[PDB]
Design a protein around this ligand. Structure first.
Ligand SMILES: COCc1cc(Br)ccn1
Lengths: 262, 302
């Protein structure tokens, strides 16, 4: 029904496809950052996963913040001492956009363990807004996933949660995931989740909607399948912890498949 | 962005809100008349307001003749000026000056048709307006009408998730919001436009309640109290009570007597209880009521 906007879902999907291209970060910004690395970014994202957990924020909020951060770091060079300030303002701006009840600024100051001042957080909020030119309605993995979910026959919560999980894992690791558009990571995540749980594959009907096939998704899928296999070993564990919770059906506890036959 | 307050000469105040003050102003170099909305970040205990972040981000991407254009954003350290395309009046003020004569049927039809275009454009870009009312619809001298004030708007996902409750000025608020429903969608913007359609005809609010529960009751007395047949799920809704009086639906020719058969048809589809059956803006544009509008689609601005 209307909750799925039958009259507008195609218009909206096409528009998200256009915007994801405009909102895309520079794929190789880290090698142009003198003082920060993929590893440091991973630590930041993992931490933002914990903040969203602690403040019971929407997963959408988390995705928007990472989008803001990656875009910011594409044109602004940042000292390792200040990375967390960028992340904090990003989370704030994402929360004010996407949350019914955003945490107050002071709570954001609190989670940085008084590394920064309220004044510093609000000034980075302004800088981020300047740098992004207030373009904050960015497409996320989640906005695509939720549409892809409408193609399940029938709906399966394990599938939906697992896909969300795999999408989240991709936020952590700029190499390789900066090179994939949200819509593609989402496609990979959905197919992997579906395969893992039910044995089925990326459906015909999503080939109609998206123009993507197992062929076109294959690169991303091979990466996401590795990330899934290695996830217990990753330095960063906050997403696995989160997805043990019953809220997400404990999906981090499912066993990845050993092969995709793709 | 490429704008500077030195290029503007203020002309007069034209409005205010918790948003702040709005001035009519003139671009001293191009000649362009604009509305400046000032947001005093000066008071920034919480930094830039969420209303402004939403308004700006959402308006950036909505270029359409029937949506007011954000021309620019001047972001000083002390203040935030939104530069808008200027429109001389709002629909509420015009109706107060449309005295008793009323609005001629050609002009109602034109306005409703433009409003649907604007709204269809919003829904097509994953934006709910969530405060459609006559005060927030601007008219110009050329006969255009444009959705304005996107401070309460919101970027939605598909399917929608739970958003802020008791959104929408009360008289224009949909049954599903009033009943505390977990999820609401594009259908709430249609309801508001429905209420507004009626209001353009009569020059009086269709459901002017003075509380949530009074609002419901006025709706129920007009369209009948909904049950499982007209609206499956209704009796299961969080703020649905079995004790609700059961009013019979009055014939629709009595709700807005001057309205023709086509008008009545369109209005009934805009005011359908079931959000799932309520007409979309996109479908409503094809309704026979509009067959004979020939006012040129107004042009987009630069
Ligand atoms: C478009 O110019 C009229 C106007 C614009 C705004 Br924003 C607020 C009040 N009045």
């Amino acid at each position: 029904g209307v909750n799925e906007v039958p009259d507008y879902h195609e218009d909206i999907h096409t528009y998200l496809r256009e915007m994801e291209v405009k909102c895309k970060p520079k794929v190789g910004y880290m090698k142009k950052q003198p003082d920060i690395t993929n590893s440091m970014r991973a630590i930041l994202v993992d931490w933002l996963v914990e903040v969203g957990e602690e403040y019971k924020l929407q997963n959408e909020t988390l995705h928007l913040a990472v989008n803001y951060i990656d875009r910011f770091l594409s044109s602004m060079s940042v000292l390792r001492g200040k990375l967390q300030l960028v992340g904090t303002a990003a989370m704030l701006l994402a929360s004010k956009f996407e949350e019914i009840y955003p945490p107050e600024v002071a709570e954001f100051v609190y989670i940085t363990d008084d590394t920064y001042t309220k004044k510093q957080v609000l000034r980075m909020e302004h800088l981020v807004l300047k740098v992004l030119a207030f373009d904050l309605a960015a497409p996320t993995i989640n906005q695509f996933l939720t549409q892809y979910f409408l193609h399940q026959q029938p709906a399966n919560c394990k599938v939906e949660s697992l896909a969300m999980f795999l999408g989240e894992l991709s936020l952590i690791d700029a190499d390789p995931y900066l090179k994939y558009l949200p819509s593609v990571i989402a496609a990979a995540a959905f197919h992997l989740a579906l395969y893992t749980v039910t044995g089925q594959s990326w459906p015909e009907s999503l080939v109609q909607k998206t123009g993507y096939t197992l062929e076109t998704l294959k690169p991303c899928l091979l990466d996401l399948h590795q990330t899934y296999l290695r996830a217990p070993q990753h330095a960063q564990q906050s997403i696995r912890e989160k997805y043990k919770n019953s809220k997400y059906h404990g999906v981090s506890l499912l066993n990845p498949p050993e092969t995709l036959n793709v | 962005g490429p704008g500077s307050m030195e290029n503007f000469q203020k002309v007069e105040k034209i409005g205010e809100g918790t948003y702040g003050v709005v001035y009519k102003a003139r671009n001293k170099l191009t000649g362009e008349v604009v509305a400046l909305k000032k947001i005093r970040l000066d008071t920034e205990t919480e930094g830039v307001p969420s209303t402004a972040i939403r308004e700006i981000s959402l308006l950036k991407e909505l270029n359409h003749p029937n949506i007011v254009k954000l021309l620019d954003v001047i972001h000083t350290e002390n203040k935030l000026y939104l530069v808008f395309e200027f429109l001389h009046q709002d629909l509420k003020k015009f109706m107060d000056a449309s005295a008793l004569t009323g609005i001629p049927l050609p002009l109602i039809k034109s306005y409703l048709f433009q409003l649907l275009q604007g709204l269809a454009f919003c829904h097509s870009h994953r934006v709910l307006h969530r405060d459609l009312k006559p005060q927030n619809l601007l008219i110009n001298t050329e006969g255009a009408i444009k959705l304005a004030d996107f401070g309460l708007a919101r970027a939605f996902g598909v399917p929608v998730r739970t958003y802020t409750h008791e959104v929408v000025t009360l008289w224009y608020r949909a049954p599903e919001i009033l009943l505390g429903c977990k999820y609401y969608s594009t259908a709430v913007d249609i309801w508001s436009l429905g209420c507004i359609f009626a209001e353009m005809v009569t020059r009086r609010a269709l459901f002017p309640g003075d509380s949530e529960i009074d609002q419901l009751f006025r709706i129920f007395r007009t369209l009948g109290t909904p049950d499982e047949v007209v609206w499956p799920g209704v009796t299961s809704m969080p703020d649905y009570k079995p004790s609700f009086p059961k009013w019979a639906r009055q014939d629709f020719s009595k709700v807005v007597p001057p309205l023709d058969e086509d008008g009545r048809s369109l209005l009934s589809q805009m005011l359908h209880y079931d959000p799932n059956k309520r007409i979309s803006a996109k479908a409503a544009l094809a309704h026979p009521f509009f067959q004979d509008v020939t006012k040129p689609v107004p042009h987009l601005r630069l």
